Design an enzyme around this catalytic site. Structure first.
Site, PDB file in Angstrom:
ATOM      1  N   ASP A 239     -14.000  13.725   6.062  1.00  0.00           N
ATOM      2  CA  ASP A 239     -13.793  13.546   4.634  1.00  0.00           C
ATOM      3  C   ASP A 239     -12.506  14.229   4.183  1.00  0.00           C
ATOM      4  OD1 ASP A 239     -14.000  13.200   1.933  1.00  0.00           O
ATOM      5  OD2 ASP A 239     -15.679  14.599   1.679  1.00  0.00           O
TER       6      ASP A 239
ATOM      7  N   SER B   6       1.351   6.210  -5.688  1.00  0.00           N
ATOM      8  CA  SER B   6       1.692   4.852  -5.315  1.00  0.00           C
ATOM      9  C   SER B   6       2.719   4.289  -6.293  1.00  0.00           C
ATOM     10  CB  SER B   6       0.431   3.989  -5.304  1.00  0.00           C
ATOM     11  OG  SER B   6       0.708   2.612  -5.119  1.00  0.00           O
TER      12      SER B   6
END
Ligand SMILES: C[C@@H]1C[C@H](C)CN(Cc2nc(N)nc(N(C)C)n2)C1
EC number: 3.4.23.22
Length: 330
Positions: free
Chosen positions: A35, A199
């Protein structure tokens, strides 16, 4: 040193991925959920409340000659999905794919929430976010990666998740045969303890690319792709009959649909998520309403590039002094 381990979807939907991990002496192999959105290595154990264990493999520290109680240490964690676990702490030898760390904090669960009990395939979590998020008190502990880093050939790990197929976590090297083209690296902020990056935009299907900054985290422990409501609405508007359902808890679409791809930007590069990756199948057995793999982050407080996004790429988690993230197509 290096390590290389195969990671395998737990079910037919790729809800999560499990990777075998050797703990203790002699080795006890548990299948852990790696994770990159948390920083605790915790396991079902001989200390876990009996009624909360249902099929998981447990770690038994009393059977490990290298286990030692970390005296006074406790831990307690809550995840984004409302699940939780807590307990006490041992140090022991932990190996992943041939890479060994001695003195790793292994957090032994005394209690786990129902979602963990119900998932018989996940024996615990191995956190790979920054150690500043680790919950052990009063002495915060380091992740497996941070402990291994100095020994690694290069201070990196990579995630290569499969779509309905096994994939790989590598430590200490970049497998240049595992991706196509070049890797595009992008800046990371560690201020919130995550692999947080920005992004450069998105496209829906064959549509034109929208240049826009989207700050989010690379999180292997989250199933879906969670993005701003504007972006998610633009995606689902291209699917006839798709709608946001408050009763179901997100966007659903007719199971008869063919889903468009979704592209996200990494610098001037582009990663394309095929439409099929965005299909999570019927909301309940036999239903003709299917659950979407792109959902709104509104109310989470952060955008999350979860498995839906990451599995479309070869992803480098560069833990150099100034960390960065790399993405390549594959
Ligand atoms: C947000 C949750 C809420 C619960 C009540 C129903 N499920 C339906 C569902 N169906 C399907 N097919 N897949 C998912 N996920 C991948 C999360 N979830 C969505």
């Amino acid at each position: 040193s290096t390590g290389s381990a195969t990671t395998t979807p737990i079910d037919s939907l790729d809800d999560a991925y499990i990777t075998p991990v050797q703990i203790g002496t002699p080795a006890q192999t548990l299948n852990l959920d790696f994770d990159t959105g948390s920083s605790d290595l915790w396991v079902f154990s001989s200390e876990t409340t009996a009624s909360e264990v249902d099929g998981q493999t447990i770690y038994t520290p009393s059977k490990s000659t290298t286990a030692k109680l970390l005296s006074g240490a406790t831990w307690s964690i809550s995840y984004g999905d409302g699940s939780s676990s807590s307990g006490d702490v041992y140090t022991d030898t932990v190996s992943v794919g041939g890479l060994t760390v001695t003195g790793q904090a292994v957090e032994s669960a005394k209690k786990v929430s129902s979602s963990f009990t119900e998932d018989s395939t996940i024996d615990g979590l191995l956190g790979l976010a920054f150690s500043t998020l680790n919950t052990v008190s009063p002495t915060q502990q380091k992740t497996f990666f941070d402990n291994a880093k100095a020994s690694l050939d290069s201070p990196v790990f990579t995630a290569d998740l499969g779509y309905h197929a096994p994939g790989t976590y590598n430590f200490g090297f970049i497998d240049t045969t595992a991706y196509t083209g070049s890797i595009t690296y992008t800046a990371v902020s560690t201020k919130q303890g995550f692999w947080e990056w920005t992004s450069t935009g998105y496209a829906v299907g064959s549509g034109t690319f929208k240049s826009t900054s989207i700050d989010g985290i690379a999180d292997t422990g989250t199933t879906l792709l969670y993005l701003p409501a504007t972006v998610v609405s633009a995606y689902w508007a291209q699917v006839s009959g798709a709608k946001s359902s408050s009763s179901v808890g997100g966007y659903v679409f007719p199971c008869s649909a063919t889903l468009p791809s979704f592209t996200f930007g990494v610098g001037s590069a582009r990663i394309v998520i095929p439409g099929d990756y965005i299909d999570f199948g019927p909301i309940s057995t036999g239903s003709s309403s299917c659950f979407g793999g792109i959902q709104s982050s509104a109310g989470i407080g952060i955008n999350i590039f979860g498995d839906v996004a990451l599995k479309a790429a070869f992803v480098v988690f560069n833990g150099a002094t100034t960390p960065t993230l790399g993405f390549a197509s594959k």
